[PDB]
């Protein structure tokens, strides 16, 4: 209902966790499990690549279509670009339906 491609076998979930590292266990033995660990985090790059297939547009309509066009009027901030403080902002939602096929 939200949108997109209903799949029976979606791209599988990728779960990730830091392996816990204990911290300074006492010398004498105790059965209770460790309540204290090293405080640590991890970081690194992630690379996702998807190969899309397209349906080429083949039509005979005479007059020109509607297209998605960023307006040419001068403004304080360009759309879809960083501002002066570095905060990237998307100005408006972009639907996918512009080209026109006859019903």
């Amino acid at each position: 209902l939200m949108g997109g491609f209903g799949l029976k076998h979606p791209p599988p979930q990728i779960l990730i966790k830091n392996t816990p590292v204990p911290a300074n266990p006492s010398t004498t033995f105790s059965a209770a499990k460790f309540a204290s660990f090293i405080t640590q985090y991890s970081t690194g790059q992630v690379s996702v690549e998807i190969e899309w297939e397209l349906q080429k547009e083949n039509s005979k309509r005479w007059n020109p279509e509607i297209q998605y066009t960023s307006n040419y009027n001068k403004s304080v901030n360009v759309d879809f670009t960083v501002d002066t403080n570095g905060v990237y902002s998307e100005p408006r939602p972009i639907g996918t339906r512009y080209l026109t096929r006859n019903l």
Binding site: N77, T81, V82, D83, T84, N85, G86, Y88
Partner: protein, 104 residues
């Protein structure tokens, strides 16, 4: 390969083969972090003169420019080329970055 093995050797030399001269130069660079790792647009402050307005972006990236001559030619190598030759043009270059070390 590894942390212990060095990636490249210092090459700074100028050899005059005959028609062609091959000039090599090596330097050590240091790259800070610009804009705290984020893009920013920049523009002319308030207003000053109609001619001086500008609009543009400032990226965190940084770049190498060897575009000046004296990078490649020592004053003496310049003197040889200049006194003994009518003309010179470049042919091909090769660029190398090595021994990178990051410090926190």
């Amino acid at each position: 390969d590894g942390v212990g093995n060095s990636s490249g050797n210092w090459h700074c030399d100028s050899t005059w083969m005959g028609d062609r001269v091959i000039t090599t130069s090596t330097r050590t660079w240091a790259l800070p972090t610009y804009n705290n790792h984020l893009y920013k647009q920049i523009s002319s402050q308030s207003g000053a003169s109609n001619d001086n307005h500008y609009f543009g972006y400032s990226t965190p990236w940084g770049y190498f420019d060897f575009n000046r001559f004296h990078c490649h030619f020592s004053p003496r190598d310049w003197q040889r080329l200049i006194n003994n030759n009518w003309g010179f043009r470049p042919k091909r270059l090769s660029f190398k970055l090595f021994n990178i070390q990051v410090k926190e």
